[PDB]
């Protein structure tokens, strides 16, 4: 600041690493005073895209207590949402042929639902219904819990299409068309949850009413996932009360729904009351489902707190009940996210090599990714040797730790290790290796890494074979949708543009891997797709036309797969 | 008379079940039930058991209430299912013998003359065995004091049979230990032994000190004679015994000098082969 000019770099990095919202609000006001508006706009866009929630709240409150409108709107995110949607809706150009093929090849097993998940991945954010519209006598073949997944899927197609949300959903008349199903009502609230992620906006005060009245079996499951999604990270006490009361009702199917949602709102708050109440209800209960909920719901309460969490860890890690020990491993994962701290590695390896119960060995070795992704060149050096242990669970964990460590970039050694494993005798480890490869190779063309056209064909082999195990082709038909996400226009990364760890992405991809225990959780991956584009602008209101020019390209890179 | 009792796992597990469940009827410190079993010859094998409703009072030992009719009915049904077992005795839990117990014994001794009492300590302890077995006999007591009835200890052991051990071994598969062990299991045993020995020696104090305080009367008749014997029985290092030094060295000239050596020569042989092969494979490609 003593230097000649104010700037971004100091105010971008230091004031949010230091968490000094007053200082940034002051320098922002000063930059308004001398009428240098372009700096004051660029700083807002730079800030929103990498500042935490609630930090924005204190900044906006200190500020407002004209330029006010055009700075508040760009500060809360509204036009960033608008612009992103407007990019995806125009650059969409998915190829329907693959869906037509897999649809024709499917037999009437579980793979049916595995189609309608992957479909929603590729048309994500694109607001286009075509594959669910041109045929319907086929989609009506779904029944029971499947109807919950399929009707939830609309929520990931219309991601961010916030403005009209409610009118759209009732436009399907889910409640009026027949009272003969509760699964549709159960799905509706889940879809509203997916559309408004983080932006609880108005809809919190609508869901909070709608959850009050319930055919308590299913409607409360949908409702609590939706409400736990819309309001995440805000620590709002009035919500927490209602989720606690639903949890204490002690019902299996309503268990882990609240078990998660009560964890999302408190995220990172370290709240010393919630931890003691939740761990106290995890002991001395007798339904596994509720434990499989709280196994996640606990860990998210601590986040980046690092050493200031240790005390809970070496308590929770001693418990006899295995689900608690697994949740201990998830907690030591989230505590140190991105931070290559050695002793956490030492613990995770000791557990993975020693413990007697396989699921904690999986969840141990799997979490190595979350604490190493700052240096993806290093992950293969450690996980490689694990990939040959005799018991399958450790192999599955290894494959997924690779998929989650190197996620964004086609690092060659990872593919080099995954190649042999795609033909492991044990079905579910093939299910693992396929999805890991698909994550790690999103948007890669042959010139940028060589192996792609191996894998792009291999899936269509498996999915068309008929002498194979169902779960393998499940993993394949999911990988298709992973590889062509959002009309090729979106990518997965945990690092932010400038070195910050983007929390929604970590949360979404962590809670994705639970697809092992409950299928409708797989949609939670959609939080991780970030658009990958440059927006030309000259005034917030004004996108003027320009042509950029990309040198040193034969023009054979970029948009792939027309053929 | 009996020289030893053999207890099967099934009774132990059923006793744990009883003690956990009893909270469903009314809080109690301990539980009581029948033991069924059989006689081979002076050895007694126990193989089943069942609950019986029982109640007590915490202070007055004159008050308690067992139940005849439930006992007879249930034994009738069990006999209708199988005929080779018969009544043999009874068990209770709680960690220490209660004064009351003899009064119970002289009851159900009527159902079997050689009623033996087994105490099973359900909550854990580190030092050793879980169970104790006792038999009731009168005595000369002294040169001259009234004859009475008390128990004496009889040695006890835990048994097994075909198709009861297989279920146990399956249940215990997750946690396992080396069958023999190679200096990692024998060495631990010695430590455990020293723990037990020190436990007993410390327990002697809690009696002998408080009798020296005069808090309780001297049991002159028995204890002191045995503890004169004890202090008599240790040994001593007396120039003649240390001449059996000539045994340590003869262990070592079988260990050290004739087992280490042929453990190094093998390692040199392996190293030579390794260097040969690795250098050969190097120059072959060059």
């Amino acid at each position: 600041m003593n230097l000649e000019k104010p700037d971004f770099i100091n105010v971008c990095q230091c004031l949010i690493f230091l968490d000094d919202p007053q200082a940034v609000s002051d320098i922002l006001e000063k930059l308004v005073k001398e009428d240098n508006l372009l700096m004051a706009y660029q700083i807002c866009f730079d800030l929103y895209e990498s500042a935490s929630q609630q930090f924005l709240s204190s900044v906006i409150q200190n500020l407002r207590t004209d330029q006010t409108l055009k700075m508040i709107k760009i500060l809360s995110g509204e036009m960033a949402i608008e612009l992103h949607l407007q990019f995806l809706i125009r650059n969409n150009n998915t190829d329907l042929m693959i869906l037509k093929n897999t649809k024709d090849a499917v037999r009437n097993s579980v793979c049916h639902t595995a189609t309608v998940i992957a479909n929603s991945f590729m048309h994500c954010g694109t607001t286009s219904d075509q594959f669910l519209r041109d045929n319907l006598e086929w989609l009506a073949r779904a029944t029971n819990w499947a109807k919950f997944t399929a009707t939830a899927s609309l929520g990931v197609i219309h991601k961010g299409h916030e403005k009209e949300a409610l009118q759209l959903m009732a436009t399907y008349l889910p409640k009026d068309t027949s009272p003969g199903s509760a699964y549709q009502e159960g799905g509706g609230l889940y879809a509203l949850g997916l559309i408004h992620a983080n932006h609880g906006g108005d809809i919190i005060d609508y869901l909070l009413n709608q959850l009050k009245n319930a055919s308590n079996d299913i409607v409360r499951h949908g409702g609590s996932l939706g409400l736990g999604l819309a309001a995440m990270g805000t620590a709002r006490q009035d919500v927490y009360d209602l989720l606690k009361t639903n949890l204490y009702q002690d019902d299996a199917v309503t268990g882990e729904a609240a078990g998660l949602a009560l964890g999302l709102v408190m995220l990172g708050s370290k709240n010393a009351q919630a931890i003691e109440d939740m761990v106290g209800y995890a002991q001395e209960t007798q339904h596994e489902k509720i434990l499989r909920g709280l196994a996640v719901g606990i860990a998210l309460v601590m986040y980046g707190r690092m050493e200031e969490a240790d005390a809970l860890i070496e308590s929770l890690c001693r418990d006899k009940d295995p689900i608690l020990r697994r949740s201990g491993m998830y907690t030591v994962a989230m505590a140190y996210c991105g931070s290559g701290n050695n002793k956490a590695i030492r613990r995770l390896l000791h557990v993975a090599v020693s413990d007697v119960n396989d699921d904690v060995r999986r969840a141990a070795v799997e979490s190595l990714g979350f604490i190493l992704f700052r240096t993806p060149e290093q992950c293969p050096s450690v996980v490689s040797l694990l990939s040959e242990s005799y018991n399958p669970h450790v192999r599955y964990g290894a494959a997924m730790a690779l998929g989650i460590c190197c996620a964004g970039t086609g690092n060659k050694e990872a593919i080099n290790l995954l190649e042999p494993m795609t033909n492991d005798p044990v079905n579910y480890v093939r299910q693992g290796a396929l999805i890991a490869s698909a994550l790690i190779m999103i948007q890669q063309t042959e010139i940028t890494c060589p192996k792609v056209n191996q894998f792009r064909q291999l899936y269509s082999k498996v999915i068309n074979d008929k002498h194979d195990d169902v779960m393998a082709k499940f993993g394949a038909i999911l990988a298709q949708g992973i590889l062509d996400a959002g009309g090729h226009n979106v990518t997965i990364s945990l690092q932010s543009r400038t070195g910050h760890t983007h929390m929604p992405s970590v949360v979404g991809v962590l809670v994705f891997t639970q697809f092992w225990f409950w299928f409708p959780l797989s949609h939670f991956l959609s939080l991780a797709y970030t658009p990958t584009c440059v927006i030309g602008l000259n005034k917030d209101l004004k996108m003027p036309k320009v042509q950029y020019k990309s040198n040193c390209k034969p023009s054979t890179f970029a948009y792939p797969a027309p053929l | 008379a009996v020289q030893k009792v053999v207890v099967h796992p099934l009774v132990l597990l059923s006793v744990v079940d009883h003690f956990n469940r009893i909270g469903k009827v009314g809080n109690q410190k301990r539980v009581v039930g029948v033991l069924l079993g059989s006689w081979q010859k002076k050895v007694l094998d126990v193989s089943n058991s069942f609950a019986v409703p029982f109640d007590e009072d915490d202070k007055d030992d004159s008050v308690w209430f067992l139940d005849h009719d439930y006992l007879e009915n249930m034994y009738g049904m069990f006999k209708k299912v199988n005929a080779r077992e018969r009544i043999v005795g009874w068990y209770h839990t709680g960690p220490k013998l209660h004064k009351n117990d003899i009064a119970i014994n002289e009851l159900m001794k009527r159902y079997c003359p050689n009623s033996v009492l087994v105490i099973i300590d359900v909550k854990p302890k580190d030092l050793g065995l879980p169970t104790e077995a006792y038999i009731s006999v009168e005595e000369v007591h002294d040169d001259g004091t009234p004859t009475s009835k008390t128990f004496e200890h009889v040695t006890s052991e835990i048994g097994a049979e075909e198709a009861e051990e297989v279920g146990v071994e399956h249940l215990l598969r997750d946690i396992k230990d080396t069958t023999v062990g190679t200096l990692s299991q024998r060495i631990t045993n010695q430590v455990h032994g020293l723990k037990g020995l020190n436990s007993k020696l410390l327990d002697i104090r809690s009696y002998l000190e408080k009798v020296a305080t005069g808090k309780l009367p001297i049991n002159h008749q028995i204890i002191y004679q045995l503890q004169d014997v004890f202090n008599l029985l240790p040994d001593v290092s007396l120039q003649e015994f240390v001449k059996a030094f000539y045994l340590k060295t003869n262990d070592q000239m079988v260990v050290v000098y004739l087992a280490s050596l042929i453990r190094s020569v093998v390692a040199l042989h392996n190293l030579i082969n390794n260097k040969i092969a690795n250098r050969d494979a190097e120059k072959k490609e060059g």
């Binding site: 308590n216 204490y248 009702q249 002690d250 106290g280 209800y281 001395e284 209960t285 007798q286 | 009893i22 909270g23 469903k24 009827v25 009314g26 809080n27």
Partner: protein, 76 residues
């Protein structure tokens, strides 16, 4: 000492009791004013499963606590 019992039907019912009581007595009071058979009553407190054989003080229950009643539907 009043205690609030909540049913799955949405009803809250207030029973005055004393700390010396025992769970079967409470279930008897329920059978009194609910009319549901005491054997058909199951009571959960904070996730724990209460036993008919014990005292309130065994579960540290204080004034105005909430207990949840659940029925058994095996008779379908």
């Amino acid at each position: 000492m009043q205690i609030f019992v909540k049913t799955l039907t949405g009803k809250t019912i207030t029973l005055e009791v004393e700390p010396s009581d025992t769970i079967e007595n409470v279930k008897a009071k329920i059978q009194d004013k609910e009319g549901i058979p005491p054997d058909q009553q199951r009571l959960i407190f904070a996730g724990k499963q209460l036993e008919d054989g014990r005292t309130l003080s065994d579960y540290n229950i204080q004034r105005e606590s909430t207990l949840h009643l659940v029925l058994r539907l095996r008779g379908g």
